[PDB]
Design a binder for this molecule. Structure first.
Ligand code: HEM
Ligand SMILES: CC(C)CC[C@@H](O)[C@@H](C)[C@H]1CC[C@H]2[C@@H]3CC=C4C[C@@H](O)CC[C@]4(C)[C@H]3CC[C@]12C
Length: 470
C-alpha cells in the first residue's frame, strides 16, 4: 500500500497561516523561487495549502511522466481565478482556454487543423517570413541612426510589435505596420492591455474572486479594464476583417485563420470571436519575452552564438532554396529555442487534475487534486541538467551518449499543450535566422538579469542589447 495523501511533507494543514507567511515573506512575485526552496526543504514532492487552495508539487521527470498517464482524454490545468472571474462575472463567451470537457475538445479539434497541422504550418511561412525581414530592416534603420554602425538599447517594445504583427498577419492576412516610424496607437492599447491583464492578476490569485471589491479594489479595476481593451479591440479587427473578405473574395491565396474557421464550417460564430481573441492575445508577449531571452543568452555566450550562425549560414549556401527548404536544416537552432524555454519558461509550472487516483513517488494522489509541475525549478536543478547555468543547445540533440532523454516542456504536453505552440516555434525560428545572418548581438556589460513572477515569467530589469552587422 502507498503512503496516504495527508503524509506528503507540506508546511502545515493551516491554509490561512501559510498565507500570512506567504504575504509576510513577500512571496507574491517570487513564487518560483519558493518552489526551489520548498523542494530543497521537503524533497521531491510537497503540498502547500494557501487559504483553501491546496496542491501537490513535483519535479522529477519520471513523476511528470507518470502524472501525465492519468491526465485524461480531456485534460484540465489550473484555472486563473481572476481570468475566469472576469468572464463569468461579465458573461463573456469563453474559448479553448476556459472551455471544459467535450465542449472543450470540440473547439480544439477544429483549432489543431487550422494552427497546428503541418500544412496550416507550411501555409504560414509566407505570412511570417516577411514580418521578420521587416524587423531586420527596423534594426538597419537604427544602426544608420545612432550613426556609428551599431545599435544600443532595450528592444522589448519592438519585440511586442513584431509579435503582434506576426499573430495578426496569420489570423487576418493584413499588415499593421507596428514596425513603422509611427505605429498604431489603438494597437499599442491592446498590446499594453495584454501585459496589464497579466501584471494585475498576481495580487488577485490568492484572494476570493467575489471578494475583489474590498481587499483588492484597485488591482481589480485595472485587470477588468485590461480585459475590456483586449475584447473590444480583438472584436474590432474581427469585424473590419470579416468585412475585408466578406465582399471582395473572388480568388485564392492564404491561411487566414479568421477565414479558414469561417470556411471549414466546423465552429459556430460565437466561438470564433472568442477563440481569435485568445489567439491574438497569446502572440503579444510570450514570443516577445522568449525571443528577448534567446538574444540575451546568445550575448552571454558568443561561442554558441557563432555555432548558430554557422548552421544558419550553412542552410543558406547549402539549400539555395528559399526559407522553406532551410527550416529542416537548422536543428541546433530549434534546440536553441528549447534551451531557452528551459532557462526561461513562460509558464512557472504545468498543472493537471488527475482523472483517477494514482501514486507519485510513494504516496496516494486522490483523483481531482491539483498537481503541479515545477518547470521553472526543473530547469535550474543540476540533478536534471549538467551545469544548468550554461546555455547548451546540444542538450536537446545529443541522442548518442544518452541512456535517458526528456522532452522540453516549455509548451506543455499531451493533447492540451499550447495550441499556439507551432506558430510560436516557427515565428521564432525565422526571426532568428534573419537575426543570425545579419547581426552579431552582444551586451554593453556583464549581464545579470533574474526573473520575476507576473503570471507569465519575465526578466526583472530592462535588457540592453547591442547589434552590429555580419
Ligand atoms: C513561446 C510562446 C508560447 C509558450 C511558451 C506558450 C506556452 C503555453 C503553455 C505552457 C500553456 C499551458 C500548456 C498546458 O496546459 O500543458 C499554453 C496555453 C495556450 N497558449 Fe500558449 N504559449 C505561447 C505562445 C502562444 C501563442 C502564440 C498563443 C496563441 C496563438 C498562445 C495561446 C495559447 C492558448 C489559447 C492555449 C490554451 C490551450 C488549451 O488549453 O487548449 N500561446 N501555452
Ligand atoms: C489569453 C492568454 C492569457 C493565453 C496565454 C497563454 O499562451 C499562456 C502564456 C498561459 C496559459 C496558461 C497559463 C498558466 C495558467 C496557470 C499557471 C499556474 C499559476 O499559479 C502560475 C501561472 C501559470 C503557470 C500560467 C502561465 C501562463 C500560461 C502558460
Amino acid at each position: 500500500t502507498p503512503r496516504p495523501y495527508s503524509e506528503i511533507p507540506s508546511p502545515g494543514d493551516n491554509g490561512w497561516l501559510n498565507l500570512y507567511h506567504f504575504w509576510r515573506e513577500k512571496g507574491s512575485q517570487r513564487i518560483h523561487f519558493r518552489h526551489i526552496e520548498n523542494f530543497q526543504k521537503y524533497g521531491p514532492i510537497y503540498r502547500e495549502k494557501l487559504g483553501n487552495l491546496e496542491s501537490v508539487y513535483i519535479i522529477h521527470p519520471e513523476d511528470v511522466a507518470h502524472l501525465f498517464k492519468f491526465e485524461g482524454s480531456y485534460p484540465e490545468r489550473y484555472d486563473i481565478p481572476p481570468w475566469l472571474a472576469y468572464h463569468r462575472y461579465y458573461q463573456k463567451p469563453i474559448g479553448v482556454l476556459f472551455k471544459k470537457s467535450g465542449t472543450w475538445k470540440k473547439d480544439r479539434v477544429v483549432l489543431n487543423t487550422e494552427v497546428m497541422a503541418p500544412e496550416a504550418i507550411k501555409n504560414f511561412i509566407p505570412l511570417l517570413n516577411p514580418v521578420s525581414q521587416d524587423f531586420v530592416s527596423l534594426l538597419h534603420k537604427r544602426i544608420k541612426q545612432q550613426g556609428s554602425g551599431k545599435f544600443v538599447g532595450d528592444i522589448k517594445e519592438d519585440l511586442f510589435h513584431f509579435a503582434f504583427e506576426s499573430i495578426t498577419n496569420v489570423m487576418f492576412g493584413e499588415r499593421l505596420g507596428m514596425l513603422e516610424e509611427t505605429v498604431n496607437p489603438e494597437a499599442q492599447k491592446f498590446i499594453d492591455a495584454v501585459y496589464k491583464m497579466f501584471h494585475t492578476s498576481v495580487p488577485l490569485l490568492n484572494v476570493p474572486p467575489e471578494l475583489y471589491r474590498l481587499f483588492r479594489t484597485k488591482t481589480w479595476r485595472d485587470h477588468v479594464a485590461a480585459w475590456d481593451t483586449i475584447f473590444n479591440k480583438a472584436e474590432k479587427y474581427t469585424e473590419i476583417f470579416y468585412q475585408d473578405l466578406r465582399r471582395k473574395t473572388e480568388f485564392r491565396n492564404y491561411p487566414g485563420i479568421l477565414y479558414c474557421l469561417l470556411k471549414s464550417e466546423k465552429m459556430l460564430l460565437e466561438d470564433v470571436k472568442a477563440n481569435i481573441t485568445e489567439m491574438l492575445a497569446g502572440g503579444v508577449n510570450t514570443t516577445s519575452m522568449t525571443l528577448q531571452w534567446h538574444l540575451y543568452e546568445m550575448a552571454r555566450s558568443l561561442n554558441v552564438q557563432e555555432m548558430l550562425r554557422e548552421e544558419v549560414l550553412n542552410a543558406r549556401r547549402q539549400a539555395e532554396g528559399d526559407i522553406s527548404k532551410m527550416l529542416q536544416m537548422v536543428p541546433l537552432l530549434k534546440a536553441s529555442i528549447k534551451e531557452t524555454l528551459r532557462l526561461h519558461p513562460i509558464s512557472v509550472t504545468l498543472q493537471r487534475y488527475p482523472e483517477s487516483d494514482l501514486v507519485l513517488q510513494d504516496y496516494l494522489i486522490p483523483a481531482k487534486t491539483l498537481v503541479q509541475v515545477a518547470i521553472y525549478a526543473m530547469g535550474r536543478d543540476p540533478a536534471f541538467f549538467s551545469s544548468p547555468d550554461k546555455f547548451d543547445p546540444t542538450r536537446w540533440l545529443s541522442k548518442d551518449k544518452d541512456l535517458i532523454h526528456f522532452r522540453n516542456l516549455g509548451f506543455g504536453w499531451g493533447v492540451r499543450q499550447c495550441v499556439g505552440r507551432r506558430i510560436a516555434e516557427l515565428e521564432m525560428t525565422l526571426f532568428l535566422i534573419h537575426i543570425l545572418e545579419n547581426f552579431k548581438v552582444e551586451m554593453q556589460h556583464i549581464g545579470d538579469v533574474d526573473t520575476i513572477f507576473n503570471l507569465i515569467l519575465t526578466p526583472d530589469k530592462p535588457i540592453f542589447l547591442v547589434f552590429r552587422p555580419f
